[PDB]
């Protein structure tokens with residue numbers, strides 16, 4: 001089969017994980033989607049000339065059993081850590097997601113991208129400078145997205161793929 005990249009979208013409820021995933025996969029903005037639904041989506045894409053499959057888990061938080069969380073984190077190759085630029089708590093929550101993924105994968109080298117979503121809104125509590133500082137501290141890219149307008153969306157996911165490639169070549 002063509003190469004598959006197993007991506008996982010994490011972040012607080014309300015940041016736009018589902019909207020980002022559906023915009024990536026289907027090229028439409030779904031502005032109401034139950035925050036408690038967790039599902040995987042697939043799309044065949046071309047990234048830097050490589051035809052590949054993205055297998056994307058749109059997470060929704062706690063699981064029936066924590067073992068289910070640990071399972072998807074171990075299976076997942078790269079993580080989109082999403083906050084909303086107008087929600088400081090969601091940004092603070094990134095610290096927890098960063099830690100939890102590393103802790104489960106038992107790794108200090110996990111492909112991730114920091115995503116600040118909802119960039120179409122003028123309302124903002126997290127300045128780009130602050131988000132860049134966090135991404136720098138993690139050694140990962142930072143991308144601002146709007147799932148609403150699709151700005152930055154392919155970049156966020158394709159950049160994550162490129163981070164996975166960097167990890168795999170070691």
Ligand SMILES: Nc1nc2c(ncn2[C@@H]2O[C@H](COP(=O)(O)OP(=O)(O)O)[C@@H](O)[C@H]2O)c(=O)[nH]1
Nearest residue numbers: 013014015016017018019031035118146147148
């Ligand atoms: N303006 C704007 N609203 C967004 C964006 N992404 C998501 N939303 C809205 O934010 C809310 C939460 O989005 P959702 O995708 O359900 O977030 P999730 O809980 O992280 O899956 C919904 O009201 C969406 O319409 C965005 O980029 N811009």
Ligand SMILES: [Mg+2]
Nearest residue numbers: 017018034035
């Ligand atoms: Mg959702």
